[PDB]
């Protein structure tokens, strides 16, 4: 990506333990903002954990389209379900029933409204907003 997604910084405490080798402040900021794209074991681990906390990924590794659509609806986008699922499905067309978390991220972020949707989800999860001390993106 050359244009950033504009996702806000997520502070999901049970997934902080997946940030092991990344130590640079801004690099960790991009992790928490789900702006990472590189297929590394570390990024995979963290994004997998986040998507588990999002309810987007179950214990068997299947994507949960109902959780995604719920977030769209809760962000006020109720008349877009077809476009959202077709964007995801087309993007995932070469992948099987248990895809890796970085590829799921790449596909869910193609819809232009996904950053707004997930930003509204963070707004209603105050525990997921880092305070002044813990934030990396400031």
mmCIF file of N, CA and C in Angstrom:
data_model
loop_
_atom_site.group_PDB
_atom_site.id
_atom_site.type_symbol
_atom_site.label_atom_id
_atom_site.label_comp_id
_atom_site.label_asym_id
_atom_site.label_seq_id
_atom_site.Cartn_x
_atom_site.Cartn_y
_atom_site.Cartn_z
ATOM 1 N N UNK A 1 0.823 -1.202 0.000
ATOM 2 C CA UNK A 1 0.000 0.000 0.000
ATOM 3 C C UNK A 1 0.862 1.258 0.000
ATOM 4 N N UNK A 2 0.471 2.237 -0.818
ATOM 5 C CA UNK A 2 1.093 3.556 -0.805
ATOM 6 C C UNK A 2 0.239 4.604 -0.105
ATOM 7 N N UNK A 3 -1.071 4.375 0.002
ATOM 8 C CA UNK A 3 -1.970 5.230 0.765
ATOM 9 C C UNK A 3 -2.361 4.504 2.045
ATOM 10 N N UNK A 4 -2.147 5.092 3.222
ATOM 11 C CA UNK A 4 -2.444 4.375 4.471
ATOM 12 C C UNK A 4 -3.935 4.140 4.648
ATOM 13 N N UNK A 5 -4.259 3.084 5.404
ATOM 14 C CA UNK A 5 -5.657 2.736 5.656
ATOM 15 C C UNK A 5 -6.336 3.743 6.573
ATOM 16 N N UNK A 6 -5.586 4.372 7.473
ATOM 17 C CA UNK A 6 -6.196 5.268 8.437
ATOM 18 C C UNK A 6 -6.918 4.574 9.573
ATOM 19 N N UNK A 7 -6.504 3.351 9.933
ATOM 20 C CA UNK A 7 -7.044 2.669 11.104
ATOM 21 C C UNK A 7 -6.403 3.241 12.366
ATOM 22 N N UNK A 8 -7.192 3.359 13.437
ATOM 23 C CA UNK A 8 -6.678 3.865 14.705
ATOM 24 C C UNK A 8 -5.892 2.782 15.452
ATOM 25 N N UNK A 9 -5.099 3.224 16.435
ATOM 26 C CA UNK A 9 -4.216 2.327 17.183
ATOM 27 C C UNK A 9 -5.015 1.466 18.158
ATOM 28 N N UNK A 10 -4.949 0.147 17.985
ATOM 29 C CA UNK A 10 -5.639 -0.777 18.874
ATOM 30 C C UNK A 10 -4.701 -1.246 19.978
ATOM 31 N N UNK A 11 -5.160 -1.138 21.224
ATOM 32 C CA UNK A 11 -4.419 -1.640 22.382
ATOM 33 C C UNK A 11 -5.195 -2.828 22.934
ATOM 34 N N UNK A 12 -4.869 -4.016 22.442
ATOM 35 C CA UNK A 12 -5.554 -5.237 22.834
ATOM 36 C C UNK A 12 -4.574 -6.015 23.702
ATOM 37 N N UNK A 13 -4.714 -5.850 25.021
ATOM 38 C CA UNK A 13 -3.734 -6.361 25.977
ATOM 39 C C UNK A 13 -3.366 -7.827 25.779
ATOM 40 N N UNK A 14 -4.304 -8.773 25.630
ATOM 41 C CA UNK A 14 -3.889 -10.180 25.458
ATOM 42 C C UNK A 14 -3.127 -10.458 24.169
ATOM 43 N N UNK A 15 -3.038 -9.505 23.239
ATOM 44 C CA UNK A 15 -2.254 -9.696 22.025
ATOM 45 C C UNK A 15 -0.920 -8.972 22.062
ATOM 46 N N UNK A 16 -0.699 -8.122 23.066
ATOM 47 C CA UNK A 16 0.582 -7.437 23.195
ATOM 48 C C UNK A 16 1.735 -8.424 23.319
ATOM 49 N N UNK A 17 1.483 -9.597 23.906
ATOM 50 C CA UNK A 17 2.519 -10.615 24.053
ATOM 51 C C UNK A 17 2.978 -11.206 22.726
ATOM 52 N N UNK A 18 2.253 -10.964 21.636
ATOM 53 C CA UNK A 18 2.684 -11.403 20.315
ATOM 54 C C UNK A 18 3.686 -10.451 19.674
ATOM 55 N N UNK A 19 3.875 -9.259 20.239
ATOM 56 C CA UNK A 19 4.869 -8.305 19.742
ATOM 57 C C UNK A 19 6.179 -8.629 20.451
ATOM 58 N N UNK A 20 6.997 -9.438 19.795
ATOM 59 C CA UNK A 20 8.227 -9.963 20.369
ATOM 60 C C UNK A 20 9.449 -9.283 19.758
ATOM 61 N N UNK A 21 9.664 -9.465 18.453
ATOM 62 C CA UNK A 21 10.874 -8.962 17.817
ATOM 63 C C UNK A 21 10.764 -7.515 17.362
ATOM 64 N N UNK A 22 9.558 -6.973 17.219
ATOM 65 C CA UNK A 22 9.414 -5.578 16.824
ATOM 66 C C UNK A 22 9.591 -4.693 18.047
ATOM 67 N N UNK A 23 10.602 -3.825 18.017
ATOM 68 C CA UNK A 23 10.889 -2.939 19.137
ATOM 69 C C UNK A 23 10.793 -1.465 18.789
ATOM 70 N N UNK A 24 10.981 -1.093 17.523
ATOM 71 C CA UNK A 24 10.868 0.309 17.143
ATOM 72 C C UNK A 24 9.458 0.827 17.396
ATOM 73 N N UNK A 25 9.382 2.050 17.935
ATOM 74 C CA UNK A 25 8.105 2.615 18.362
ATOM 75 C C UNK A 25 7.117 2.693 17.208
ATOM 76 N N UNK A 26 7.536 3.285 16.089
ATOM 77 C CA UNK A 26 6.608 3.442 14.981
ATOM 78 C C UNK A 26 6.249 2.095 14.360
ATOM 79 N N UNK A 27 7.213 1.166 14.269
ATOM 80 C CA UNK A 27 6.903 -0.153 13.719
ATOM 81 C C UNK A 27 5.840 -0.859 14.551
ATOM 82 N N UNK A 28 5.904 -0.717 15.878
ATOM 83 C CA UNK A 28 4.853 -1.265 16.728
ATOM 84 C C UNK A 28 3.545 -0.509 16.534
ATOM 85 N N UNK A 29 3.625 0.794 16.271
ATOM 86 C CA UNK A 29 2.420 1.565 15.986
ATOM 87 C C UNK A 29 1.693 1.002 14.768
ATOM 88 N N UNK A 30 2.438 0.706 13.694
ATOM 89 C CA UNK A 30 1.823 0.168 12.482
ATOM 90 C C UNK A 30 1.203 -1.205 12.724
ATOM 91 N N UNK A 31 1.821 -2.003 13.594
ATOM 92 C CA UNK A 31 1.263 -3.272 14.038
ATOM 93 C C UNK A 31 -0.125 -3.055 14.641
ATOM 94 N N UNK A 32 -0.204 -2.177 15.652
ATOM 95 C CA UNK A 32 -1.447 -1.921 16.381
ATOM 96 C C UNK A 32 -2.503 -1.242 15.511
ATOM 97 N N UNK A 33 -2.086 -0.504 14.483
ATOM 98 C CA UNK A 33 -3.007 0.121 13.542
ATOM 99 C C UNK A 33 -3.378 -0.813 12.396
ATOM 100 N N UNK A 34 -2.934 -2.074 12.458
ATOM 101 C CA UNK A 34 -3.190 -3.075 11.422
ATOM 102 C C UNK A 34 -2.786 -2.569 10.035
ATOM 103 N N UNK A 35 -1.753 -1.735 9.983
ATOM 104 C CA UNK A 35 -1.226 -1.235 8.720
ATOM 105 C C UNK A 35 -0.075 -2.078 8.193
ATOM 106 N N UNK A 36 0.438 -3.012 8.998
ATOM 107 C CA UNK A 36 1.461 -3.937 8.529
ATOM 108 C C UNK A 36 0.956 -4.721 7.324
ATOM 109 N N UNK A 37 1.880 -5.071 6.435
ATOM 110 C CA UNK A 37 1.572 -5.940 5.307
ATOM 111 C C UNK A 37 2.541 -7.098 5.138
ATOM 112 N N UNK A 38 3.710 -7.057 5.767
ATOM 113 C CA UNK A 38 4.743 -8.050 5.520
ATOM 114 C C UNK A 38 4.393 -9.372 6.195
ATOM 115 N N UNK A 39 4.548 -10.464 5.445
ATOM 116 C CA UNK A 39 4.258 -11.821 5.913
ATOM 117 C C UNK A 39 5.450 -12.326 6.715
ATOM 118 N N UNK A 40 5.465 -11.964 7.991
ATOM 119 C CA UNK A 40 6.420 -12.491 8.950
ATOM 120 C C UNK A 40 5.666 -13.281 10.007
ATOM 121 N N UNK A 41 6.356 -14.247 10.620
ATOM 122 C CA UNK A 41 5.742 -15.002 11.699
ATOM 123 C C UNK A 41 5.222 -14.113 12.810
ATOM 124 N N UNK A 42 5.928 -13.013 13.095
ATOM 125 C CA UNK A 42 5.486 -12.104 14.148
ATOM 126 C C UNK A 42 4.187 -11.410 13.769
ATOM 127 N N UNK A 43 4.137 -10.824 12.570
ATOM 128 C CA UNK A 43 2.919 -10.150 12.135
ATOM 129 C C UNK A 43 1.743 -11.121 12.091
ATOM 130 N N UNK A 44 1.975 -12.338 11.584
ATOM 131 C CA UNK A 44 0.944 -13.372 11.566
ATOM 132 C C UNK A 44 0.434 -13.672 12.965
ATOM 133 N N UNK A 45 1.345 -13.850 13.922
ATOM 134 C CA UNK A 45 0.922 -14.142 15.282
ATOM 135 C C UNK A 45 0.062 -13.040 15.871
ATOM 136 N N UNK A 46 0.490 -11.785 15.711
ATOM 137 C CA UNK A 46 -0.244 -10.671 16.308
ATOM 138 C C UNK A 46 -1.607 -10.490 15.652
ATOM 139 N N UNK A 47 -1.646 -10.482 14.317
ATOM 140 C CA UNK A 47 -2.909 -10.278 13.615
ATOM 141 C C UNK A 47 -3.869 -11.430 13.889
ATOM 142 N N UNK A 48 -3.355 -12.668 13.929
ATOM 143 C CA UNK A 48 -4.203 -13.802 14.299
ATOM 144 C C UNK A 48 -4.835 -13.587 15.666
ATOM 145 N N UNK A 49 -4.039 -13.150 16.645
ATOM 146 C CA UNK A 49 -4.579 -12.890 17.974
ATOM 147 C C UNK A 49 -5.633 -11.786 17.934
ATOM 148 N N UNK A 50 -5.365 -10.700 17.202
ATOM 149 C CA UNK A 50 -6.329 -9.599 17.125
ATOM 150 C C UNK A 50 -7.634 -10.086 16.515
ATOM 151 N N UNK A 51 -7.541 -10.805 15.397
ATOM 152 C CA UNK A 51 -8.739 -11.310 14.740
ATOM 153 C C UNK A 51 -9.492 -12.309 15.619
ATOM 154 N N UNK A 52 -8.786 -13.054 16.476
ATOM 155 C CA UNK A 52 -9.485 -13.883 17.454
ATOM 156 C C UNK A 52 -10.244 -13.016 18.460
ATOM 157 N N UNK A 53 -9.632 -11.924 18.917
ATOM 158 C CA UNK A 53 -10.330 -11.028 19.833
ATOM 159 C C UNK A 53 -11.483 -10.314 19.137
ATOM 160 N N UNK A 54 -11.338 -10.035 17.841
ATOM 161 C CA UNK A 54 -12.406 -9.449 17.037
ATOM 162 C C UNK A 54 -13.556 -10.413 16.788
ATOM 163 N N UNK A 55 -13.388 -11.698 17.107
ATOM 164 C CA UNK A 55 -14.356 -12.692 16.687
ATOM 165 C C UNK A 55 -14.323 -13.000 15.209
ATOM 166 N N UNK A 56 -13.346 -12.451 14.479
ATOM 167 C CA UNK A 56 -13.237 -12.683 13.042
ATOM 168 C C UNK A 56 -12.695 -14.067 12.716
ATOM 169 N N UNK A 57 -11.952 -14.664 13.636
ATOM 170 C CA UNK A 57 -11.334 -15.968 13.444
ATOM 171 C C UNK A 57 -11.697 -16.848 14.623
ATOM 172 N N UNK A 58 -12.145 -18.067 14.338
ATOM 173 C CA UNK A 58 -12.492 -19.001 15.395
ATOM 174 C C UNK A 58 -11.289 -19.867 15.764
ATOM 175 N N UNK A 59 -11.529 -20.830 16.656
ATOM 176 C CA UNK A 59 -10.453 -21.687 17.120
ATOM 177 C C UNK A 59 -9.956 -22.652 16.066
ATOM 178 N N UNK A 60 -10.796 -22.977 15.087
ATOM 179 C CA UNK A 60 -10.399 -23.844 13.985
ATOM 180 C C UNK A 60 -9.807 -23.085 12.805
ATOM 181 N N UNK A 61 -9.712 -21.761 12.891
ATOM 182 C CA UNK A 61 -9.069 -20.976 11.859
ATOM 183 C C UNK A 61 -9.949 -20.591 10.695
ATOM 184 N N UNK A 62 -11.264 -20.598 10.864
ATOM 185 C CA UNK A 62 -12.176 -20.188 9.811
ATOM 186 C C UNK A 62 -12.582 -18.732 10.018
ATOM 187 N N UNK A 63 -12.687 -17.991 8.917
ATOM 188 C CA UNK A 63 -13.137 -16.607 8.979
ATOM 189 C C UNK A 63 -14.631 -16.533 9.287
ATOM 190 N N UNK A 64 -15.018 -15.546 10.090
ATOM 191 C CA UNK A 64 -16.396 -15.371 10.553
ATOM 192 C C UNK A 64 -16.998 -14.142 9.868
ATOM 193 N N UNK A 65 -17.633 -14.372 8.713
ATOM 194 C CA UNK A 65 -18.266 -13.281 7.976
ATOM 195 C C UNK A 65 -19.368 -12.599 8.784
ATOM 196 N N UNK A 66 -20.025 -13.317 9.699
ATOM 197 C CA UNK A 66 -21.082 -12.674 10.476
ATOM 198 C C UNK A 66 -20.511 -11.627 11.417
ATOM 199 N N UNK A 67 -19.329 -11.889 11.981
ATOM 200 C CA UNK A 67 -18.700 -10.896 12.844
ATOM 201 C C UNK A 67 -18.359 -9.636 12.061
ATOM 202 N N UNK A 68 -17.795 -9.796 10.857
ATOM 203 C CA UNK A 68 -17.483 -8.640 10.017
ATOM 204 C C UNK A 68 -18.735 -7.819 9.720
ATOM 205 N N UNK A 69 -19.795 -8.474 9.241
ATOM 206 C CA UNK A 69 -21.013 -7.741 8.894
ATOM 207 C C UNK A 69 -21.617 -7.054 10.112
ATOM 208 N N UNK A 70 -21.538 -7.692 11.284
ATOM 209 C CA UNK A 70 -21.985 -7.042 12.515
ATOM 210 C C UNK A 70 -21.248 -5.727 12.746
ATOM 211 N N UNK A 71 -19.932 -5.717 12.520
ATOM 212 C CA UNK A 71 -19.174 -4.484 12.705
ATOM 213 C C UNK A 71 -19.622 -3.418 11.716
ATOM 214 N N UNK A 72 -19.848 -3.800 10.454
ATOM 215 C CA UNK A 72 -20.392 -2.858 9.480
ATOM 216 C C UNK A 72 -21.718 -2.284 9.969
ATOM 217 N N UNK A 73 -22.632 -3.152 10.409
ATOM 218 C CA UNK A 73 -23.934 -2.679 10.877
ATOM 219 C C UNK A 73 -23.790 -1.750 12.076
ATOM 220 N N UNK A 74 -22.956 -2.133 13.046
ATOM 221 C CA UNK A 74 -22.747 -1.308 14.227
ATOM 222 C C UNK A 74 -22.056 0.012 13.899
ATOM 223 N N UNK A 75 -21.328 0.087 12.789
ATOM 224 C CA UNK A 75 -20.790 1.359 12.335
ATOM 225 C C UNK A 75 -21.792 2.162 11.509
ATOM 226 N N UNK A 76 -23.023 1.676 11.353
ATOM 227 C CA UNK A 76 -24.039 2.394 10.602
ATOM 228 C C UNK A 76 -24.134 2.052 9.129
ATOM 229 N N UNK A 77 -23.385 1.054 8.660
ATOM 230 C CA UNK A 77 -23.432 0.582 7.270
ATOM 231 C C UNK A 77 -24.290 -0.679 7.213
ATOM 232 N N UNK A 78 -25.584 -0.518 6.947
ATOM 233 C CA UNK A 78 -26.494 -1.656 6.971
ATOM 234 C C UNK A 78 -26.929 -2.143 5.590
ATOM 235 N N UNK A 79 -26.605 -1.431 4.519
ATOM 236 C CA UNK A 79 -27.144 -1.747 3.200
ATOM 237 C C UNK A 79 -26.032 -2.059 2.208
ATOM 238 N N UNK A 80 -24.968 -2.695 2.706
ATOM 239 C CA UNK A 80 -23.748 -2.927 1.951
ATOM 240 C C UNK A 80 -23.278 -4.375 2.034
ATOM 241 N N UNK A 81 -24.093 -5.275 2.596
ATOM 242 C CA UNK A 81 -23.610 -6.614 2.931
ATOM 243 C C UNK A 81 -23.075 -7.342 1.704
ATOM 244 N N UNK A 82 -23.795 -7.262 0.581
ATOM 245 C CA UNK A 82 -23.358 -7.950 -0.630
ATOM 246 C C UNK A 82 -21.994 -7.450 -1.086
ATOM 247 N N UNK A 83 -21.822 -6.128 -1.173
ATOM 248 C CA UNK A 83 -20.545 -5.583 -1.627
ATOM 249 C C UNK A 83 -19.399 -5.977 -0.702
ATOM 250 N N UNK A 84 -19.663 -6.078 0.600
ATOM 251 C CA UNK A 84 -18.603 -6.413 1.542
ATOM 252 C C UNK A 84 -18.175 -7.865 1.369
ATOM 253 N N UNK A 85 -19.145 -8.776 1.263
ATOM 254 C CA UNK A 85 -18.823 -10.194 1.154
ATOM 255 C C UNK A 85 -18.216 -10.542 -0.197
ATOM 256 N N UNK A 86 -18.633 -9.850 -1.256
ATOM 257 C CA UNK A 86 -18.068 -10.110 -2.574
ATOM 258 C C UNK A 86 -16.659 -9.549 -2.687
ATOM 259 N N UNK A 87 -16.391 -8.421 -2.024
ATOM 260 C CA UNK A 87 -15.029 -7.905 -1.973
ATOM 261 C C UNK A 87 -14.104 -8.892 -1.273
ATOM 262 N N UNK A 88 -14.534 -9.412 -0.119
ATOM 263 C CA UNK A 88 -13.735 -10.401 0.598
ATOM 264 C C UNK A 88 -13.552 -11.665 -0.235
ATOM 265 N N UNK A 89 -14.656 -12.212 -0.768
ATOM 266 C CA UNK A 89 -14.599 -13.497 -1.470
ATOM 267 C C UNK A 89 -13.755 -13.420 -2.737
ATOM 268 N N UNK A 90 -13.905 -12.353 -3.522
ATOM 269 C CA UNK A 90 -13.059 -12.212 -4.694
ATOM 270 C C UNK A 90 -11.592 -12.134 -4.320
ATOM 271 N N UNK A 91 -11.282 -11.362 -3.282
ATOM 272 C CA UNK A 91 -9.901 -11.231 -2.836
ATOM 273 C C UNK A 91 -9.335 -12.556 -2.333
ATOM 274 N N UNK A 92 -10.176 -13.424 -1.767
ATOM 275 C CA UNK A 92 -9.745 -14.697 -1.204
ATOM 276 C C UNK A 92 -9.918 -15.872 -2.176
ATOM 277 N N UNK A 93 -10.107 -15.609 -3.471
ATOM 278 C CA UNK A 93 -10.568 -16.677 -4.353
ATOM 279 C C UNK A 93 -9.548 -17.807 -4.486
ATOM 280 N N UNK A 94 -8.256 -17.529 -4.323
ATOM 281 C CA UNK A 94 -7.251 -18.580 -4.447
ATOM 282 C C UNK A 94 -6.928 -19.263 -3.127
ATOM 283 N N UNK A 95 -7.706 -19.021 -2.081
ATOM 284 C CA UNK A 95 -7.381 -19.514 -0.755
ATOM 285 C C UNK A 95 -8.466 -20.463 -0.259
ATOM 286 N N UNK A 96 -8.058 -21.403 0.593
ATOM 287 C CA UNK A 96 -8.935 -22.438 1.087
ATOM 288 C C UNK A 96 -9.644 -22.050 2.370
ATOM 289 N N UNK A 97 -10.256 -23.032 3.037
ATOM 290 C CA UNK A 97 -11.140 -22.691 4.169
ATOM 291 C C UNK A 97 -10.411 -22.188 5.409
ATOM 292 N N UNK A 98 -9.097 -22.383 5.537
ATOM 293 C CA UNK A 98 -8.350 -21.915 6.710
ATOM 294 C C UNK A 98 -7.150 -21.079 6.276
ATOM 295 N N UNK A 99 -7.385 -19.852 5.833
ATOM 296 C CA UNK A 99 -6.291 -18.984 5.386
ATOM 297 C C UNK A 99 -5.566 -18.306 6.539
ATOM 298 N N UNK A 100 -4.333 -17.889 6.258
ATOM 299 C CA UNK A 100 -3.533 -17.203 7.263
ATOM 300 C C UNK A 100 -4.076 -15.804 7.549
ATOM 301 N N UNK A 101 -3.806 -15.324 8.766
ATOM 302 C CA UNK A 101 -4.448 -14.104 9.258
ATOM 303 C C UNK A 101 -4.020 -12.864 8.478
ATOM 304 N N UNK A 102 -2.755 -12.798 8.042
ATOM 305 C CA UNK A 102 -2.320 -11.662 7.230
ATOM 306 C C UNK A 102 -3.085 -11.583 5.914
ATOM 307 N N UNK A 103 -3.403 -12.728 5.302
ATOM 308 C CA UNK A 103 -4.167 -12.667 4.056
ATOM 309 C C UNK A 103 -5.607 -12.249 4.316
ATOM 310 N N UNK A 104 -6.197 -12.711 5.423
ATOM 311 C CA UNK A 104 -7.535 -12.246 5.787
ATOM 312 C C UNK A 104 -7.535 -10.726 5.963
ATOM 313 N N UNK A 105 -6.529 -10.199 6.672
ATOM 314 C CA UNK A 105 -6.382 -8.751 6.836
ATOM 315 C C UNK A 105 -6.298 -8.043 5.493
ATOM 316 N N UNK A 106 -5.456 -8.556 4.592
ATOM 317 C CA UNK A 106 -5.308 -7.926 3.291
ATOM 318 C C UNK A 106 -6.645 -7.868 2.568
ATOM 319 N N UNK A 107 -7.466 -8.904 2.719
ATOM 320 C CA UNK A 107 -8.725 -8.945 1.987
ATOM 321 C C UNK A 107 -9.824 -8.112 2.658
ATOM 322 N N UNK A 108 -9.924 -8.127 3.993
ATOM 323 C CA UNK A 108 -10.956 -7.315 4.639
ATOM 324 C C UNK A 108 -10.672 -5.823 4.508
ATOM 325 N N UNK A 109 -9.411 -5.426 4.341
ATOM 326 C CA UNK A 109 -9.106 -4.009 4.228
ATOM 327 C C UNK A 109 -9.251 -3.480 2.810
ATOM 328 N N UNK A 110 -9.663 -4.308 1.847
ATOM 329 C CA UNK A 110 -9.849 -3.765 0.508
ATOM 330 C C UNK A 110 -11.110 -2.919 0.404
ATOM 331 N N UNK A 111 -12.172 -3.276 1.119
ATOM 332 C CA UNK A 111 -13.363 -2.433 1.115
ATOM 333 C C UNK A 111 -13.026 -1.063 1.687
ATOM 334 N N UNK A 112 -13.423 -0.006 0.970
ATOM 335 C CA UNK A 112 -13.015 1.339 1.367
ATOM 336 C C UNK A 112 -13.570 1.741 2.724
ATOM 337 N N UNK A 113 -14.648 1.112 3.182
ATOM 338 C CA UNK A 113 -15.213 1.514 4.459
ATOM 339 C C UNK A 113 -14.663 0.733 5.640
ATOM 340 N N UNK A 114 -13.835 -0.296 5.426
ATOM 341 C CA UNK A 114 -13.392 -1.076 6.580
ATOM 342 C C UNK A 114 -12.670 -0.241 7.630
ATOM 343 N N UNK A 115 -11.783 0.702 7.294
ATOM 344 C CA UNK A 115 -11.141 1.460 8.377
ATOM 345 C C UNK A 115 -12.133 2.217 9.238
ATOM 346 N N UNK A 116 -13.131 2.864 8.632
ATOM 347 C CA UNK A 116 -14.143 3.561 9.424
ATOM 348 C C UNK A 116 -14.869 2.587 10.343
ATOM 349 N N UNK A 117 -15.233 1.425 9.805
ATOM 350 C CA UNK A 117 -15.969 0.419 10.564
ATOM 351 C C UNK A 117 -15.178 -0.026 11.787
ATOM 352 N N UNK A 118 -13.906 -0.378 11.592
ATOM 353 C CA UNK A 118 -13.133 -0.895 12.712
ATOM 354 C C UNK A 118 -12.767 0.240 13.670
ATOM 355 N N UNK A 119 -12.646 1.470 13.158
ATOM 356 C CA UNK A 119 -12.451 2.624 14.033
ATOM 357 C C UNK A 119 -13.677 2.873 14.908
ATOM 358 N N UNK A 120 -14.882 2.706 14.355
ATOM 359 C CA UNK A 120 -16.071 2.818 15.195
ATOM 360 C C UNK A 120 -16.136 1.694 16.221
ATOM 361 N N UNK A 121 -15.643 0.501 15.876
ATOM 362 C CA UNK A 121 -15.627 -0.574 16.858
ATOM 363 C C UNK A 121 -14.692 -0.234 18.006
ATOM 364 N N UNK A 122 -13.536 0.355 17.699
ATOM 365 C CA UNK A 122 -12.637 0.786 18.764
ATOM 366 C C UNK A 122 -13.268 1.873 19.618
ATOM 367 N N UNK A 123 -14.064 2.760 19.009
ATOM 368 C CA UNK A 123 -14.713 3.810 19.794
ATOM 369 C C UNK A 123 -15.652 3.225 20.845
ATOM 370 N N UNK A 124 -16.298 2.085 20.562
ATOM 371 C CA UNK A 124 -17.171 1.470 21.557
ATOM 372 C C UNK A 124 -16.475 0.391 22.389
ATOM 373 N N UNK A 125 -15.142 0.283 22.308
ATOM 374 C CA UNK A 125 -14.340 -0.611 23.154
ATOM 375 C C UNK A 125 -13.249 0.239 23.802
ATOM 376 N N UNK A 126 -13.611 1.021 24.820
ATOM 377 C CA UNK A 126 -12.653 1.968 25.390
ATOM 378 C C UNK A 126 -11.405 1.277 25.933
ATOM 379 N N UNK A 127 -11.519 0.014 26.358
ATOM 380 C CA UNK A 127 -10.329 -0.721 26.774
ATOM 381 C C UNK A 127 -9.325 -0.895 25.639
ATOM 382 N N UNK A 128 -9.776 -0.842 24.385
ATOM 383 C CA UNK A 128 -8.903 -1.026 23.232
ATOM 384 C C UNK A 128 -8.251 0.265 22.765
ATOM 385 N N UNK A 129 -8.523 1.390 23.423
ATOM 386 C CA UNK A 129 -7.825 2.626 23.114
ATOM 387 C C UNK A 129 -6.660 2.795 24.071
ATOM 388 N N UNK A 130 -5.426 2.952 23.590
ATOM 389 C CA UNK A 130 -4.313 3.183 24.513
ATOM 390 C C UNK A 130 -4.347 4.606 25.053
ATOM 391 N N UNK A 131 -3.985 4.750 26.326
ATOM 392 C CA UNK A 131 -3.913 6.068 26.936
ATOM 393 C C UNK A 131 -2.629 6.760 26.480
ATOM 394 N N UNK A 132 -2.372 7.947 27.038
ATOM 395 C CA UNK A 132 -1.216 8.739 26.633
ATOM 396 C C UNK A 132 0.093 7.994 26.853
ATOM 397 N N UNK A 133 0.162 7.151 27.887
ATOM 398 C CA UNK A 133 1.424 6.513 28.249
ATOM 399 C C UNK A 133 1.703 5.308 27.359
ATOM 400 N N UNK A 134 0.678 4.510 27.056
ATOM 401 C CA UNK A 134 0.889 3.266 26.326
ATOM 402 C C UNK A 134 0.895 3.432 24.816
ATOM 403 N N UNK A 135 0.442 4.567 24.293
ATOM 404 C CA UNK A 135 0.270 4.697 22.852
ATOM 405 C C UNK A 135 1.613 4.820 22.143
ATOM 406 N N UNK A 136 1.738 4.120 21.016
ATOM 407 C CA UNK A 136 2.930 4.201 20.181
ATOM 408 C C UNK A 136 2.792 5.172 19.020
ATOM 409 N N UNK A 137 1.567 5.516 18.632
ATOM 410 C CA UNK A 137 1.324 6.281 17.418
ATOM 411 C C UNK A 137 1.305 7.788 17.650
ATOM 412 N N UNK A 138 1.581 8.247 18.863
ATOM 413 C CA UNK A 138 1.611 9.674 19.152
ATOM 414 C C UNK A 138 3.007 10.268 19.249
#
